[PDB]
Design an enzyme around this catalytic site. Structure first.
Site, short mmCIF file in Angstrom:
data_model
loop_
_atom_site.label_atom_id
_atom_site.label_comp_id
_atom_site.label_asym_id
_atom_site.label_seq_id
_atom_site.Cartn_x
_atom_site.Cartn_y
_atom_site.Cartn_z
N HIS A 148 17.08 63.75 50.15
CA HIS A 148 18.38 63.98 50.78
C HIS A 148 18.57 63.41 52.18
CE1 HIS A 148 19.45 66.44 47.40
NE2 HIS A 148 18.37 67.18 47.57
N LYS B 48 18.10 61.09 37.70
CA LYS B 48 18.66 62.28 38.32
C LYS B 48 20.18 62.10 38.30
CE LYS B 48 17.68 65.34 42.12
NZ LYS B 48 18.88 65.80 42.87
N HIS C 10 16.62 73.01 49.42
CA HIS C 10 17.44 72.70 48.27
C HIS C 10 18.82 72.32 48.78
CE1 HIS C 10 19.52 73.10 44.39
NE2 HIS C 10 20.37 73.90 45.01
N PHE C 11 19.41 71.30 48.18
CA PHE C 11 20.76 70.87 48.54
C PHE C 11 21.70 71.47 47.51
CE2 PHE C 11 23.38 67.99 51.09
CZ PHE C 11 24.55 68.00 50.36
N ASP C 12 22.59 72.36 47.95
CA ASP C 12 23.37 73.12 46.97
C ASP C 12 24.72 72.47 46.65
OD1 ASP C 12 22.73 75.53 45.44
OD2 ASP C 12 24.57 76.39 46.35
N1 ZF9 Z 1 18.97 79.00 46.59
C1 ZF9 Z 1 17.76 78.26 46.27
N2 ZF9 Z 1 16.70 78.41 47.02
C2 ZF9 Z 1 15.60 77.70 46.70
N3 ZF9 Z 1 15.44 76.84 45.68
C3 ZF9 Z 1 16.55 76.73 44.96
C4 ZF9 Z 1 17.76 77.42 45.21
N4 ZF9 Z 1 18.75 77.04 44.20
C5 ZF9 Z 1 18.07 76.17 43.44
N5 ZF9 Z 1 16.84 76.00 43.89
C6 ZF9 Z 1 15.88 75.15 43.25
O1 ZF9 Z 1 16.36 73.80 42.95
C7 ZF9 Z 1 16.41 73.65 41.49
C8 ZF9 Z 1 17.80 73.90 40.98
O2 ZF9 Z 1 18.57 72.74 41.01
P1 ZF9 Z 1 19.81 72.53 39.93
O3 ZF9 Z 1 19.49 73.18 38.65
O4 ZF9 Z 1 21.00 73.29 40.32
O5 ZF9 Z 1 20.16 70.92 39.77
P2 ZF9 Z 1 19.15 69.66 40.20
O6 ZF9 Z 1 19.58 68.40 39.61
O7 ZF9 Z 1 19.26 69.36 41.63
O8 ZF9 Z 1 17.59 69.95 39.76
P3 ZF9 Z 1 16.30 69.65 40.74
O9 ZF9 Z 1 16.27 68.26 41.19
O10 ZF9 Z 1 15.01 69.75 40.05
O11 ZF9 Z 1 16.36 70.68 42.02
P4 ZF9 Z 1 15.90 70.18 43.52
O12 ZF9 Z 1 14.50 69.74 43.48
O13 ZF9 Z 1 15.84 71.29 44.49
O14 ZF9 Z 1 16.92 68.96 44.01
P5 ZF9 Z 1 18.32 69.20 44.86
O15 ZF9 Z 1 17.99 69.70 46.21
O16 ZF9 Z 1 19.05 70.33 44.27
O17 ZF9 Z 1 19.30 67.84 44.90
P6 ZF9 Z 1 20.95 67.75 44.59
O18 ZF9 Z 1 21.24 67.26 43.24
O19 ZF9 Z 1 21.62 69.06 44.55
O20 ZF9 Z 1 21.78 66.89 45.49
C9 ZF9 Z 1 15.52 74.71 40.94
O21 ZF9 Z 1 14.16 74.27 40.83
C10 ZF9 Z 1 15.61 75.80 41.92
O22 ZF9 Z 1 14.40 76.58 41.95
#
Ligand code: ZF9
Ligand code: ZF9
Length: 124
Positions: free
Chosen positions: A12, A41, A119-121
């Protein structure tokens, strides 16, 4: 292999550019940051600010996280961001992205001591 805070920076942070320079920004950056390794992704956001400015969001406006946790925070100010979204022509391993450059508020989840983005929400 990687801590959550370092994974956040890899996925990010782009402190080296003030904006996406071209519509090919996402195609290049999602590859370089290893977000196209085992799959495309589908959505990612890069933030064109200092890490410090993004870490500081962890002490700004507290908001509910999409997953329902309460450790999310919305930036007081807009931030230069680039949204990367997979296109319909995209098929792994030829991942293709639309690049959207905008000024938005960012929402991140923060954890730990020190309290840092993990995490990016969303961007609003
Ligand atoms: N409030 C919170 N506090 C700490 N961790 C949190 C969290 N809400 C979600 N997570 C973690 O993130 C993933 C959910 O993500 P999601 O199911 O909603 O979609 P996702 O495609 O992003 O999947 P991942 O690329 O595996 O996740 P991240 O590694 O963290 O990438 P990220 O920061 O989200 O990039 P962006 O796409 O948003 O720009 C899960 O593993 C979750 O445990
Ligand atoms: N309660 C607070 N506690 C601690 N620090 C705070 C704070 N509120 C703001 N800051 C910080 O002071 C600097 C100026 O921020 P500021 O908030 O004072 O200028 P700003 O012009 O950027 O705001 P606004 O147009 O009022 O925003 P919104 O109306 O809600 O939407 P929008 O106009 O579209 O976006 P942005 O203009 O924000 O970029 C920033 O470094 C910010 O981090």
């Amino acid at each position: 292999k990687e801590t959550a805070a370092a994974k956040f920076e890899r996925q990010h942070m782009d402190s080296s550019t003030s904006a996406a320079s071209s519509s090919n920004y996402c195609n290049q950056m999602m590859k370089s940051r290893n977000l196209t390794k085992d799959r495309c992704k589908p959505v990612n956001t890069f933030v064109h600010e200092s890490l410090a400015d993004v870490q500081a969001v962890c002490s700004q406006k507290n908001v509910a996280c999409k997953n329902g946790q309460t450790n999310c925070y919305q930036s007081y100010s807009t931030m230069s961001i680039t949204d990367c979204r997979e296109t319909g022509s995209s098929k792994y391993p030829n991942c293709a992205y639309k690049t959207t450059q905008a000024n938005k508020h960012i929402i991140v989840a923060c954890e730990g001591n020190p309290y840092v983005p993990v995490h990016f929400d969303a961007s609003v």
